[PDB]
Amino acid sequence: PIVQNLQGQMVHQCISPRTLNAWVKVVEEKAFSPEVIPMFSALSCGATPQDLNTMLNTVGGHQAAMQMLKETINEEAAEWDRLHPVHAGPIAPGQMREPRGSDIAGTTSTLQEQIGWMTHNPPIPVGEIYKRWIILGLNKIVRMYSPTSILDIRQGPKEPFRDYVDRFYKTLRAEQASQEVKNAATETLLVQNANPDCKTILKALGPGATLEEMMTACQ
Amino acid sequence: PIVQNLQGQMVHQCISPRTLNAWVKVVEEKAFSPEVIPMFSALSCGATPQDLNTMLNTVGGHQAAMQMLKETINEEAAEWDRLHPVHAGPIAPGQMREPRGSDIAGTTSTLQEQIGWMTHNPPIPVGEIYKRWIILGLNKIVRMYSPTSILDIRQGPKEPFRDYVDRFYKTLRAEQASQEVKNAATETLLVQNANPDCKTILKALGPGATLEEMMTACQ
Amino acid sequence: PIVQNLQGQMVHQCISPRTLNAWVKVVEEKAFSPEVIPMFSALSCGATPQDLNTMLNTVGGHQAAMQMLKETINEEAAEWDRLHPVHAGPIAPGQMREPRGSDIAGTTSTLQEQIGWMTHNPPIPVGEIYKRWIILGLNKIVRMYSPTSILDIRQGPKEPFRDYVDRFYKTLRAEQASQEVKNAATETLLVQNANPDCKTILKALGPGATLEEMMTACQ
Amino acid sequence: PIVQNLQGQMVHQCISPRTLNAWVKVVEEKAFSPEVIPMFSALSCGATPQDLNTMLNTVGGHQAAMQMLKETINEEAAEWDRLHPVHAGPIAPGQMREPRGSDIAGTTSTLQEQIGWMTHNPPIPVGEIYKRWIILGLNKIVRMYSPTSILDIRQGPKEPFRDYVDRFYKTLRAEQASQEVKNAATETLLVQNANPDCKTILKALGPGATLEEMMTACQ
Amino acid sequence: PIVQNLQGQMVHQCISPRTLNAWVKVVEEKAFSPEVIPMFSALSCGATPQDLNTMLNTVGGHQAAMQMLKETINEEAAEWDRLHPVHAGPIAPGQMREPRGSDIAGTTSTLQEQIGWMTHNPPIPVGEIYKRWIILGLNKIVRMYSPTSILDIRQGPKEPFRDYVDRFYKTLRAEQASQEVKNAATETLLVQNANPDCKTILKALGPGATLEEMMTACQ
Amino acid sequence: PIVQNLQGQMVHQCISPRTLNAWVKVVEEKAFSPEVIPMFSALSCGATPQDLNTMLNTVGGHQAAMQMLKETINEEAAEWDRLHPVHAGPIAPGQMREPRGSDIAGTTSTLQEQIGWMTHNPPIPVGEIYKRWIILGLNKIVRMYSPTSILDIRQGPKEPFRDYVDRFYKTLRAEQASQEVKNAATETLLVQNANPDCKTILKALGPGATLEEMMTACQ
């Protein structure tokens, strides 16, 4: 990653063993549960494209997902190249060349180049641009791997309402519902998919009930 | 988080893998036991709003609680916006814009903006303001999840008085009794809910007994 | 805690995840065995009152003990307020107010105030004063929780003398015997509570025997 | 490894216990699965040739592979010596001698020499040159140890298409297919090796389907 | 402990959680096996008397040994006081008082005093003096706890000579044989206590055989 | 160990708990497998003679080996004293005395002396000299403890050739074959000790086959 030293410089630092192991272990333990993605983002704080590639290449399983992710990266790289074409001439001696999409993805750029871009005044933030592409790809993977439609999350007859709500919102998160839909669902599908005893209570409450008020009402 | 370097500057530092894992693991192990909240506060020392969001987004389960927490945050953000409306014009070039409630919550502000606010002279402490909102929400969750009323904590016939007191005060803490009530309960409900043999001894002690004196009296 | 940086300043540093976890884990594993107290003292090196509260609030069990500890803290705070009353007027602008007992205990003081006191020239050592109150309370807890009187530690007929001595001194430590009594007990209760075969040997040794000499004599 | 200190110098630092243990443990757990190689590269960031030798020499098993790796290193060293012959005379006093292939591999060079080369202006990057040789050797080992031809990865009759794709791409990676072949295989061998029910669906899709589109189609 | 900072000063640093836990865990796992003592010495590098007391007070078991250790410390303190009596008058204002034996042992001295002594030019090395007393006491404990006389270590009829030698030298170490005796024992008790078949071979070797030569001879 | 600080000084630093535990644990887990030796060398990077003694003294088992190692150290110390005799007069006041072999081994030298030698301009590298003696001794131990002659490593009838090669080269390493012999053995004993089916294939290959080519040929 790129860090600041005591002279007030952003400098390169090697990726740590603790970071490397943390990422490998959360993929092994959680696969593509939605919470793996904010974990990835946080573990890759300050990452260069080289570091992001390291993290993704250290994953042993899930090679269908990794191939899909490469396809998404290649799509975003091709859109970058449409928006930001580069000169096809020799580099000005000593000077900084403009990144192509494959330079952002770290496949055609060196670490030294990446450091040069990221520590330019002002930064050409290749690590943050690449991370955005990766996260777009990982969100597609999370949705693909989501096992259950929200339509199929219904409260059991003896299931605590809290347990059902947990299953409902875990499914909405994996299915990639917007925050707008999550906030709105409280007055609609959440009640519909409730068991008859709870449904009666929630129907009786009237409109505008907070989730807290619905959860208190059904115990 | 924001830290001080050797030039006497508060600087940004990436959230550590140890911090990330510590938080995920205490939620997995303790859920919304009351002691998880001071743990959250301590693990989030110096946090930016981005860091606070990372910590909350890394939680995989408990999605009913996480949705309730988002509702509480949105309430406090709307109260901030009532108290501190911002100008709806273009930013003065190079200058610092005033935060709205969604900027404090990190959903409409960048990390660079958050750093600017938190390291202004004097600080606009967006991380501490947001943390206060989060803790308000988490305390509501702890009370919701508290399984047992204090009325239902009564000493068993062969239960050591110490074990009963432990159960009593654990329940009072989850039910969110004030320190005033915790301090006062020693002369009242604690004795009432004691077993007959202890109740006799504690009744005999007279008023003003310290909890230490009650615990010594009943063994 | 408060630490020294490279400009020779004592600065605030966040409590570490390793410190937080170490304390929670020693309470879970050892409860109020006497050795938990020097552990607390060492883990809280440099602590502010805020840090001390964090450590105590992160404890999930043992809520009878935690309530007793709050009572002891409130006693010592009331004695501080008797000895060191503060002015009941507006603060001199920009200047440092004198701490009350609840400021020392971190309930009515901010972190910034605590830093101001602890880094004043010369320090008003609020963290060390509060730690002294806490340790006084924890020692009361250790004595309360000590399961066995020294009178009841007697060597078994086939118990190795070393094993008995270990049980004797572990009990003396939890019962909070002074070092004077620990040093003196070697010539008296330790021998009396020995089994007949050892008692004969130790009686034969004469007075002034070191514990080493008694332990060698009985094997 | 070589790191930068606060005077802006790249300095030597000892290899850490965490790095040493991380490498030993990933070889013990993963052997020569393909993902062990990007792990090696990342754990050896900034390594001197001495550090690279340490890492390889700390491996206890897999001595057939380690002997093969020595053979590959000796081949690349002999090619370096063909391209970059050195003077066979006495060193200019105080001056830096040119590295031979065995100096790059750390067998005939001292640590001080390696530091001199790597911190020259501009660097003679002996650690990076040697790491390239090692990685070439490790990739040969990964291919040798790959257990299964791609021809033999075929979807079972009740095997989820995702599980099959995972097995297909894991095998392609170990067999060291180019990214070109991985990207192209989606329209050809992947479909051929699918079960009849999926094969029908994928045949029906038409050409140019993304892997995401094929995986969605077959569930 | 006392450490050097970047201004070239030895400064106080808090004892780490890793150090605290390392010591507690080696006593739990090894008790007073001889190798616990060099571990203690290394974990207490740079320790103040306060730190040494912390380490010893964090031990929960082994209270017979801890009482014996206090007795040894009190003996060495009384010898220090015989050799180095201090003035029984008021301290020169602002000036450094001379340590008594109980000041070296940290029972009558403050941390600030200990820092003053240890960072004086030249140091009054109270931590190293106290550590020497502690190690003298711990060596007495190791000998007391040694279970077996060297006379009773004899090679079994089917015991590999190496296994016997290991048992012999482990016992010599716990019994606190000098290095002179360890070096000499190879020509004498080691052979005598060997089984008849080995004894014959070692007798046949002649005098002056290295332990390596004896171990090779008997397999 | 000795490290460089920010003023560009090599300074003493305490041995870490992680280093101490790493060494104890690799001896417990691997005993004198050959890979323990490069581990020792790497864990002792920058070590003083005091640190090297700490590491060796922290080993609890294997006391036959530790006594053999002391004998080897004493041999190398006596050779140093033959080559580098020292003056038998009083030290020049304030000046640096020349090390004897027992000073290099840390038995007759203080830490301060060792620091003085190792940080002299130019260094008298006592830690590196002593480490060389220790490694010479440890290599003798590894050979002594090697359980099996290379003559006795022969491929089983159903043993994969790779598994056999692994056993062959693990044995050659413990028996301390030179790299020359390891490289040459591929054309000779490795083939001879192969099973008949592999032997036929390897015989058919002709001379000069790489180990990779032999391993591919036999599967």
Ligand SMILES: O=C1CN(C(=O)OCc2ccccc2)CCN1
């Ligand atoms: O075709 C490619 C090659 N890429 C690659 O191998 O990057 C590392 C990576 C990326 C995604 C998954 C696993 C590892 C970059 C993007 N596109």
Ligand SMILES: O=C1CN(C(=O)OCc2ccccc2)CCN1
């Ligand atoms: O609607 C919203 C969106 N928020 C959000 O997603 O923040 C992170 C978070 C917050 C609470 C729980 C889990 C994660 C911010 C507040 N309100």
Ligand SMILES: O=C1CN(C(=O)OCc2ccccc2)CCN1
């Ligand atoms: O009534 C009070 C409130 N206190 C409090 O809550 O402090 C933290 C704490 C203290 C003791 C035990 C558990 C946590 C401070 C002292 N007295």
Ligand SMILES: O=C1CN(C(=O)OCc2ccccc2)CCN1
């Ligand atoms: O013959 C050699 C000797 N080498 C060697 O021993 O290096 C360390 C190493 C290298 C590969 C595998 C295990 C350990 C360097 C290259 N060629």
Ligand SMILES: O=C1CN(C(=O)OCc2ccccc2)CCN1
């Ligand atoms: O009587 C005393 C009191 N001492 C003491 O308590 O020190 C800490 C310690 C020392 C030895 C064992 C356990 C803990 C110092 C020496 N003599």
Ligand SMILES: O=C1CN(C(=O)OCc2ccccc2)CCN1
């Ligand atoms: O006789 C000696 C004494 N030595 C010694 O005790 O050093 C530490 C050590 C060395 C080897 C094995 C275990 C511990 C130094 C060398 N010769």
